[PDB]
Amino acid sequence: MHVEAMISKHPQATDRSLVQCVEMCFDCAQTCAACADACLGEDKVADLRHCIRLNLDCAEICVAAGSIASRAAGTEESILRTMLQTCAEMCRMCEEECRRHAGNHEHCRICADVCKECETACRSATG
Amino acid sequence: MHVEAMISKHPQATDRSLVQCVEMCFDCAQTCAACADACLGEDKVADLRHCIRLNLDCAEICVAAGSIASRAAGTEESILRTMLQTCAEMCRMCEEECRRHAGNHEHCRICADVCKECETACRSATG
Amino acid sequence: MHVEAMISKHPQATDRSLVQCVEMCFDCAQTCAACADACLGEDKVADLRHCIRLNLDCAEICVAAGSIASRAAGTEESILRTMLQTCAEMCRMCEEECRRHAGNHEHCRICADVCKECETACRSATG
Amino acid sequence: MHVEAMISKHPQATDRSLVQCVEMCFDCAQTCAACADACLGEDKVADLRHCIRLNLDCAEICVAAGSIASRAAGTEESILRTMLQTCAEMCRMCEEECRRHAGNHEHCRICADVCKECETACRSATG
């Protein structure tokens, strides 16, 4: 990724927790998109419906969060903290469902691990 | 829009507040994208930087919210309420900034009005 | 939608085919998201895997197209025509697959009809 | 990223050009979002209007492309090639405009370089 390089060159600019969060949002978005599709292709797709939905929700929220986190927030009201908290909660929910399938589907194991890491990164960027 | 028609035909299906919310999310997303671009093209773009950012944030959150709201949430944990609350807060913030420019820029007046309506619809879908 | 109102107020601004295209892109994006989810919830989800994928692809392309079409393109090189042509082709593909399921699933009938209309609107905006 | 890990675990699954393309799409999407915001914050924002628009267009197309490229396409008609070609053309256009500002704005230099690489990766995945 070029998150770190680009933050340093912004005219309103270092912030390690923010860089980690942005990087994880884009990684998690892709991973969740891929997991949704993999689950879709499984013989057992009917057992994976909720996992697919959560993965699609998570991909969408992660892209939004990572994009908003790439912008200057100002010092008055901004959505960044709220959005990162939403992302953390979405990643927590998606992790839980992927994790339940992790013994049966390797793609769900990987996605659960990425969601856990993205949750941690988003929650850490809020403090 | 086809929100109402599609909800009624879902196998897990009426919900007027949900239909209004989805419709408003997509309307607001487009309107905010358009307002960001219009502000970008203004002679006075330098005075509109924060408005442009909020409009881009709002467009992104509205698309995410409207997409998530188009899916079955289940009866355990789901992100829907959290996401709709985030959308409401984003629309409130974006409304406030557009409104400040509404006397000078008609596109900001229209976008403030749409954001206000989307805020109301999202907050109403949470109750 | 507020497409028409916002185009008229842009500082670089009428264009009926462009308004129709933008409106249809957002309508189709929502409809395809909803159809993907409805198909996901069907007893027969395993027969609908390709339809679900095409609907997700279509939702994503329609949002991108509708957002790009909401911006000033300039008079040198721009992506608008290329993107609208891609959207038209995606809508054609998605229509074809939804249509095949239209006898069995009302949500697929509606989505096929919306995709057809969005295809027409995008192709018309290119001429 | 987890692109490679997730492709290998898909039930319909190696493809190096596809992995490189997906990775570059998400990297480029973030970079373009960041460049648009950085240009927005410049004293000279009024000279960067077209660059900002192209960066927003590019971010949107790159996310769509990277998401579609993360899904099984089948062996009949699919949008993948068309979408990757659109992404390549968008990245070419965005590169050209960023490059013109690269002497004045380091964020534009970095974004031009990422766009060039994403263009190459998308065009290579089409062959």
XYZ file of C-alpha atoms in Angstrom, chain A:
127
model
C 0.000 0.000 0.000
C 0.956 3.722 -0.294
C -1.013 4.912 2.724
C 2.042 6.019 4.753
C 3.709 7.785 1.784
C 0.572 9.642 0.884
C -0.284 10.777 4.473
C 3.166 12.282 4.855
C 2.767 14.339 1.698
C -0.687 15.775 2.457
C -0.634 19.618 2.814
C -2.568 19.384 6.183
C -0.196 16.697 7.610
C 3.388 10.099 11.123
C 0.171 8.626 12.574
C 0.958 4.919 12.811
C -2.428 3.775 14.102
C -4.156 5.613 11.256
C -1.856 4.051 8.620
C -2.431 0.560 10.066
C -6.173 1.106 10.104
C -6.352 2.267 6.433
C -4.163 -0.576 5.261
C -6.260 -3.109 7.133
C -9.526 -1.712 5.830
C -8.545 -2.239 2.212
C -6.994 -5.681 2.951
C -10.175 -6.715 4.817
C -12.479 -5.379 2.155
C -10.811 -7.519 -0.509
C -10.628 -10.550 1.755
C -14.303 -10.345 2.648
C -15.296 -9.937 -1.029
C -13.264 -13.022 -1.830
C -14.688 -14.995 1.090
C -18.261 -14.144 0.087
C -17.523 -15.456 -3.422
C -15.774 -18.569 -2.202
C -18.636 -19.399 0.091
C -20.999 -18.839 -2.784
C -19.190 -21.485 -4.798
C -19.239 -24.128 -2.067
C -21.325 -27.272 -2.376
C -22.561 -26.182 1.086
C -23.523 -22.621 0.087
C -26.907 -23.010 1.730
C -25.176 -23.277 5.169
C -23.093 -20.178 4.433
C -25.865 -17.654 3.601
C -25.357 -15.511 6.738
C -21.577 -15.617 6.351
C -21.922 -14.395 2.750
C -24.140 -11.501 3.815
C -21.853 -10.449 6.629
C -18.866 -10.591 4.298
C -20.600 -8.354 1.772
C -21.621 -5.924 4.533
C -18.061 -5.951 5.825
C -16.467 -5.375 2.448
C -18.722 -2.361 1.880
C -18.101 -0.851 5.343
C -14.333 -1.457 5.150
C -14.077 0.389 1.800
C -16.066 3.311 3.158
C -13.993 3.424 6.339
C -10.695 3.165 4.532
C -11.672 5.938 2.117
C -12.908 8.268 4.866
C -9.802 7.572 6.897
C -7.695 8.648 3.918
C -9.175 12.239 4.130
C -8.463 15.274 6.435
C -11.178 15.287 9.164
C -10.748 18.827 10.500
C -11.026 19.716 14.208
C -14.756 20.335 14.484
C -17.248 17.599 13.927
C -16.215 14.663 11.777
C -17.428 11.176 11.063
C -14.041 9.408 11.311
C -14.371 8.071 14.856
C -17.967 6.988 14.370
C -17.110 5.281 11.067
C -14.101 3.483 12.541
C -16.225 2.265 15.429
C -18.807 0.980 12.974
C -16.101 -0.750 11.039
C -14.751 -2.356 14.183
C -18.199 -3.680 15.083
C -18.777 -4.962 11.568
C -15.429 -6.714 11.530
C -16.203 -8.244 14.972
C -19.542 -9.619 13.645
C -18.039 -10.901 10.444
C -15.135 -12.512 12.325
C -17.523 -14.402 14.570
C -19.478 -15.927 11.668
C -16.399 -16.747 9.563
C -14.777 -18.297 12.623
C -17.661 -20.721 13.043
C -16.996 -22.070 9.540
C -13.189 -21.951 9.858
C -12.863 -25.676 10.535
C -14.738 -26.535 7.373
C -13.528 -23.828 4.974
C -10.029 -22.489 4.852
C -11.167 -19.271 3.175
C -13.361 -18.594 6.231
C -10.390 -19.179 8.573
C -8.292 -16.625 6.675
C -11.149 -14.131 6.498
C -11.838 -14.498 10.270
C -8.158 -13.742 10.977
C -8.176 -10.644 8.736
C -11.390 -9.381 10.209
C -9.968 -9.766 13.712
C -6.901 -7.767 12.768
C -8.975 -5.046 11.066
C -11.224 -4.827 14.141
C -8.171 -4.326 16.339
C -6.706 -1.701 14.009
C -9.956 0.294 13.787
C -10.565 0.193 17.538
C -6.945 1.274 18.146
C -7.289 4.226 15.756
C -10.217 5.468 17.875
C -8.022 5.868 20.962
